[PDB]
């Protein structure tokens, strides 16, 4: 069977960065040519492997993670990076082996009044471990007073909404990001 790569890129709706989606690519043959010869992408950066050598390489599994962020934050999807996205939403390991592909989605994820469905985690006490997904909606305690589940001063909802408007600048415009991670394990390989 052909590898399920179109079902991640051609997807109708993308996930929020705090709840980034992961798909396990297995038991298929992969043709990465649908990717490196495409001009929709503004970022195609591969670490630990060459895109040209991917066709002749085999991995036990592949992991395709998808989310939507701001353009000014796409730089944060890279090893050894800091920021709200890299620290509290999606953290890549320093020894990352895989590719990061990002394209503009102002025609898809923007609304005239502002698309408020895409959310990012704003408040978190500690940085995210690599490939960690935090979906907690617990009220953030910014002081010594316990929140008891009610919002207010020093008691803030952890998730904030991107306002994605077509009139926004490139730095405030929505960008769809897919991160492919190639996993080689002591197991029968299923992706080639």
């Amino acid at each position, epitope marked *: 069977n052909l590898c399920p790569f179109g079902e991640v890129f051609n997807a109708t709706r993308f996930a929020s960065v705090y709840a980034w989606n992961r798909k396990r690519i297995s038991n298929c043959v992969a043709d990465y040519s649908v990717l490196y010869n495409s001009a929709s992408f503004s970022t195609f950066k*591969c670490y630990g492997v060459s895109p040209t050598k991917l066709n002749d390489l085999c991995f036990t599994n592949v992991y395709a993670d998808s989310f939507v962020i701001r353009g000014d934050e796409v730089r944060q999807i890279a090893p050894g990076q800091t920021g709200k996205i890299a620290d509290y939403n999606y953290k890549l390991p320093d020894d990352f082996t895989g590719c990061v592909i990002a394209w503009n989605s102002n025609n898809l994820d923007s609304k005239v009044g502002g698309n408020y469905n895409y959310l990012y985690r704003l408040f978190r006490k500690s940085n995210l471990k690599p490939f960690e997904r935090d979906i907690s909606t617990e009220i953030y305690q910014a002081g010594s007073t316990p929140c008891n589940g009610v919002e207010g001063f020093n008691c803030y909802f952890p998730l904030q909404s991107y306002g994605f408007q077509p009139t926004n600048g490139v730095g405030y415009q929505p960008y769809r990001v897919v991160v492919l991670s190639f996993e080689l394990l002591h197991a029968p390989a299923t992706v080639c």
Partner: nanobody
Amino acid sequence: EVQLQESGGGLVQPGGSLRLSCAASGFTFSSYAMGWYRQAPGKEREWVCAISGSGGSTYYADSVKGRFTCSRDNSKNTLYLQMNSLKPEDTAVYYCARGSFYYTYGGSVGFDAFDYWGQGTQVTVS
């Protein structure tokens, strides 16, 4: 607590040799790739070289190829740029940084540096 410092610069005659050293702290030196940059006065900073933590893969700019060799001694947590067969076009302040190698659409290789800067004495070839 990451810090990195450079040394070895000075005034040198054209055609000479000089070695610049980048000492590292706050991280495992072998784990991360390190690169050499030059900020020429009046231009933009240009990437000179970068070396993998293993040292097996080293990438050099075409300007400095065949004359400058980049080496690392992970035992001493140091990065070296062997500036030999020097030329007056090689006068600049040189900097080292941590970073990650990345491959582009066609297999081209680039070096992306983690943000940092270090005060250094200008390397002048005269």
